[PDB]
Enzyme design. Structure first.
Site, PDB file in Angstrom:
ATOM      1  N   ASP A  16       0.843  -1.313  -0.046  1.00 47.55           N
ATOM      2  CA  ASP A  16       0.054  -0.078  -0.028  1.00 47.55           C
ATOM      3  C   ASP A  16       1.035   1.146  -0.046  1.00 47.55           C
ATOM      4  OD1 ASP A  16      -2.852  -1.264   0.201  1.00 47.55           O
ATOM      5  OD2 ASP A  16      -1.800  -1.939   2.131  1.00 47.55           O
ATOM      6  N   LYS A  19       2.309   1.990  -5.100  1.00 43.66           N
ATOM      7  CA  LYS A  19       3.249   1.584  -5.989  1.00 43.66           C
ATOM      8  C   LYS A  19       2.369   1.260  -7.303  1.00 43.66           C
ATOM      9  CE  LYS A  19       3.324  -2.775  -4.216  1.00 43.66           C
ATOM     10  NZ  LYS A  19       2.820  -2.240  -3.051  1.00 43.66           N
ATOM     11  N   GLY A  43      -2.913  -5.821  -5.560  1.00 42.85           N
ATOM     12  CA  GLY A  43      -4.002  -5.124  -6.132  1.00 42.85           C
ATOM     13  C   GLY A  43      -3.966  -3.705  -6.062  1.00 42.85           C
ATOM     14  N   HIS A  44      -4.134  -2.819  -7.013  1.00 44.13           N
ATOM     15  CA  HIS A  44      -4.607  -1.237  -7.010  1.00 44.13           C
ATOM     16  C   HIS A  44      -5.628  -0.903  -8.075  1.00 44.13           C
ATOM     17  CE1 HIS A  44      -2.289  -1.296 -10.919  1.00 44.13           C
ATOM     18  NE2 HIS A  44      -2.369  -0.128 -11.002  1.00 44.13           N
ATOM     19  N   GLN A 226       3.226  -6.327  -2.755  1.00 43.65           N
ATOM     20  CA  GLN A 226       3.579  -6.136  -1.306  1.00 43.65           C
ATOM     21  C   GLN A 226       4.783  -5.284  -1.007  1.00 43.65           C
ATOM     22  OE1 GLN A 226       3.351  -9.748  -2.656  1.00 43.65           O
ATOM     23  NE2 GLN A 226       1.099  -9.242  -2.597  1.00 43.65           N
TER      24      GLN A 226
HETATM   25  N1  LIG Z   1      -1.440  -6.449  -1.502  1.00 43.74           N
HETATM   26  C1  LIG Z   1      -1.036  -6.323  -0.177  1.00 43.74           C
HETATM   27  N2  LIG Z   1      -0.999  -5.140   0.406  1.00 43.74           N
HETATM   28  C2  LIG Z   1      -0.742  -5.127   1.657  1.00 43.74           C
HETATM   29  N3  LIG Z   1      -0.416  -5.945   2.448  1.00 43.74           N
HETATM   30  C3  LIG Z   1      -0.515  -7.230   1.938  1.00 43.74           C
HETATM   31  C4  LIG Z   1      -0.797  -7.433   0.284  1.00 43.74           C
HETATM   32  N4  LIG Z   1      -0.618  -8.914   0.058  1.00 43.74           N
HETATM   33  C5  LIG Z   1      -0.374  -9.567   1.374  1.00 43.74           C
HETATM   34  N5  LIG Z   1      -0.130  -8.503   2.510  1.00 43.74           N
HETATM   35  C6  LIG Z   1       0.113  -8.924   3.665  1.00 43.74           C
HETATM   36  O1  LIG Z   1       1.251 -10.117   3.863  1.00 43.74           O
HETATM   37  C7  LIG Z   1       0.933 -10.905   4.647  1.00 43.74           C
HETATM   38  C8  LIG Z   1       0.692 -12.098   4.391  1.00 43.74           C
HETATM   39  O2  LIG Z   1      -0.544 -12.388   3.551  1.00 43.74           O
HETATM   40  P1  LIG Z   1      -0.628 -13.408   2.426  1.00 43.74           P
HETATM   41  O3  LIG Z   1       0.145 -12.878   1.311  1.00 43.74           O
HETATM   42  O4  LIG Z   1      -1.833 -13.480   2.004  1.00 43.74           O
HETATM   43  O5  LIG Z   1       0.077 -14.739   2.746  1.00 43.74           O
HETATM   44  C9  LIG Z   1      -0.069 -10.265   5.558  1.00 43.74           C
HETATM   45  O6  LIG Z   1       0.428  -9.275   6.374  1.00 43.74           O
HETATM   46  C10 LIG Z   1      -0.798  -9.314   4.650  1.00 43.74           C
HETATM   47  O7  LIG Z   1      -1.741  -8.214   5.246  1.00 43.74           O
END
Ligand SMILES: Nc1ncnc2c1ncn2[C@@H]1O[C@H](COP(=O)(O)O)[C@@H](O)[C@H]1O
Ligand SMILES: Nc1ncnc2c1ncn2[C@@H]1O[C@H](COP(=O)(O)O)[C@@H](O)[C@H]1O
Lengths: 431, 423
Positions: A16, A19, A43-44, A226
């Site tokens: 967030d 990017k 996502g954006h 991320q």
């Molecule tokens: N697009 C994103 N924006 C912000 N945080 C993310 C995003 N994708 C994953 N995360 C964070 O990455 C960690 C692992 O989530 P995941 O990638 O679903 O395993 C968690 O803290 C999520 O909130």
């Protein structure tokens, strides 16, 4: 171009950072745009041609017919989600002939989503707060070498065989480890094989695509998801995603040699945020934090769940500078800090009385880090129309300059609003 | 800057050590970036032979910093055995640096590796049985224990309890077998960590300090491109990235910090484990190559699979690992074979392709398309340059370069330091 031109856009914080609009901006002059890790956890939102889109898997360049868009081998791809995205684009008149999907990308199936949910439940108060999209379990299957890849999905015999093998183990996992129901080989096969057939037209060797572009002086842009502090190696482990958002992820995630990257843009928001659980040294719980959340629209697009917000953390960004080899800084959302009389930037951590400039690797130690901050005066002017550093109110320019001073990264772009036209260029990252 | 990566272009048995040992002489930092103790070769230092697995090849030079990066999976027991081995032989290790973010291999990883292999039946990967895969799985799962955790007594105990509760239930339910008590592992492995602690630090800081101060850095690859988790013959691969790109994620350095990538290949091909191998030989020529090349497990004596040189594989490596130049090893092994063959393409369904297919089914059916070259009979183990070779050997070497599209930088005709020569 004159010579090789390759730029990576990475998030320096916990996602967030903004990017998306920076990649959208740089996409305008890129010939190839490529994702290299993650899945639909990314996502954006973009309003393109007056129409609102939210892409999760498809790269930013897709809206331009002549730009090649690449989903690299480093991703984990939910075919159902990919097809929903394709249909959304098609319904709004966007062609996707320019999409290229790696034959070596891993495939997310319904059992990964359930495994994600069950693993989180089992961790209780130690849950990670994942996006529940099956990302972690898909990357676990990849490491386990039982994962199904795009090349397999396209093969009627191979896809059926791997489902039979995998569901034999996963159903025992669900039934015996988690006391819950599993899935059906035939039901997953019939549904997902058909998704594969609709995606097949895009599937190819994407390393060949990217290296052909690079070696022939076409401008290539790599789009990170991320951010560095969510990096499986370099982030706040275990409160991280299971891939490498750092610039290095481009090499393994698309099959390009490391010297084939020319510039790395680190995107930082003027304040910090986290969506999931885990340490967050500069986190705010006061009226300023609420103002930042409200003005910054720091809520889940779908759920409306508030994100955690905090002051800018330069310890984190100096860490990102090193582990991701940042050459250029894009500072976003400076407008969100408008109207706050005293701003703070964290310059170090205090950890049991000891002042340090590092992100500790031990989570228990990181969890004890208190922010040590500099205070800077704020401004009251609406800066959402500002075009240059010279035009900023004195205190806003000083704030921007201080971020670059503290992080050691030269400023190349800054943004004063959520729209693409609110991005200002200080230095060109293409040569 | 000087920042060189040495990578294997085949399936991990390329003679990388010959190249790393030579290049280490003028490097100031030598760093591993992936894998674990599923690596190693025999180093000759001061005339003395040493066998290592986890510790980088520069350890013998007291003035060279040796780094185990964050990208590795480290068995602390095995690491300590290697440390003691060196100390018993009068070699100091003050120059070792171990990443605080490297993952830790524990006894349950070793058992899990064996159980997973058994569960796969005829589809087993043929792993080294060192717990590598399971440790990388725990990393992706985010339940893995890292070096920083091992050093924290209470945190290590808590994670062991959490992980054993899960693993024990896993072994019972999935594999019908017993696991481990916390007592069996805790004090023993905590003590291993305490003996390693002196080396534990932020290795990204170590490497970037060297790079940013114009110190020559050498990155030491393990395995090879065709064992790469992304780019190799999946699933018959190791669970990490041996390609040059692995140095970035595996040590925490930006991509533009690497200046040269040396691809290492043998003049023939070999595999230790299971999986497709298009140029594999099952004839008298295959045996001669295995015999002369000493292609057997160093510890078990288990024979390796061998085959003709495969240029499809090396062109694949050139792309995905960004090879800058090539070292061609063990040319002497092909002596006394009247007709040599180099694979230049694959045949699948009678269709000729220049690619390694991603689909295992397609790859498993690929037949090699070969060019044939006349061989030589002469002893070439004594040559110091290509123009000293018999005509047919020089021609063979030239063709490998022509077919792979990679400039030759080094070649070898023997195991000794003086048998590796510049081109
Ligand atoms: N697009 C994103 N924006 C912000 N945080 C993310 C995003 N994708 C994953 N995360 C964070 O990455 C960690 C692992 O989530 P995941 O990638 O679903 O395993 C968690 O803290 C999520 O909130
Ligand atoms: N040092 C090595 N040399 C050759 N092959 C290796 C090496 N390490 C791992 N492999 C191969 O990599 C695959 C996975 O083994 P492991 O790395 O133990 O999971 C198997 O095919 C092994 O034979």
């Amino acid at each position: 171009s004159n010579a090789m031109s390759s730029v990576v856009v990475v998030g320096t914080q916990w996602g967030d950072e903004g990017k998306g609009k920076i990649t959208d901006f740089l996409s305008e002059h890129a010939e190839v745009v490529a994702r290299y890790q993650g899945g639909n956890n990314a996502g954006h939102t973009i309003v393109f041609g007056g129409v609102k889109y939210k892409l999760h898997l498809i790269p930013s360049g897709i809206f331009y017919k002549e730009k090649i868009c690449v989903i690299g081998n480093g991703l984990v791809v939910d075919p159902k989600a990919l097809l929903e995205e394709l249909k959304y684009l098609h319904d709004r008149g966007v062609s996707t002939d320019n999409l290229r999907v790696s034959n070596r990308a891993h495939v997310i199936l319904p059992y990964h989503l359930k495994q994600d949910e069950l693993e989180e439940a089992s961790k209780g108060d130690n849950k990670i707060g994942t996006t529940k999209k099956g990302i972690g379990p898909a990357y676990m299957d990849k490491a386990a070498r039982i994962g199904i890849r795009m090349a397999d999905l396209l093969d009627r015999e191979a896809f059926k065989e791997k489902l039979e093998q995998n569901l034999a183990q996963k159903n025992r996992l669900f039934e015996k480890m988690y006391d819950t129901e599993g899935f059906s080989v035939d039901e997953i096969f019939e549904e997902y094989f058909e998704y594969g057939q609709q995606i097949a037209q895009y599937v190819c060797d994407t390393s060949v695509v990217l290296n052909d572009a690079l070696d022939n002086n076409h401008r290539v842009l790599f789009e990170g998801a991320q951010g560095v502090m969510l990096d499986i190696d370099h982030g706040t482990y275990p409160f991280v995603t299971s891939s490498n958002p750092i610039a290095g992820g481009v090499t393994v995630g698309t099959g390009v040699g490391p010297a084939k990257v020319t510039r790395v843009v680190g995107v930082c928001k003027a304040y910090t945020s986290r969506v999931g659980d885990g340490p967050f040294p500069t986190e705010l719980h006061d009226e300023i934090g609420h103002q930042i959340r409200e003005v910054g629209r720091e809520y889940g697009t779908t759920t409306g769940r508030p994100r955690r917000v905090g002051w800018f953390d330069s310890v984190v960004v100096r860490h990102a500078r090193r582990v991701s080899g940042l050459t250029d800084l894009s500072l976003n959302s400076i407008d969100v800090l408008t109207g706050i009389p005293t701003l703070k930037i964290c310059v170090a951590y205090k950890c049991d009385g000891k002042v340090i400039d590092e992100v500790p690797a031990n989570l228990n130690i990181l969890a004890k880090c208190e922010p040590v901050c500099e205070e800077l005066p704020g401004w009251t002017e609406d800066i959402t129309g500002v075009r240059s550093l010279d035009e900023l109110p004195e205190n806003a320019r000083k704030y921007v300059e201080r971020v670059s001073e503290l992080t050691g990264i030269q400023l190349s772009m800054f943004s004063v609003g959520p729209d693409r036209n609110q991005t200002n260029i200080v230095r060109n990252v293409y040569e």
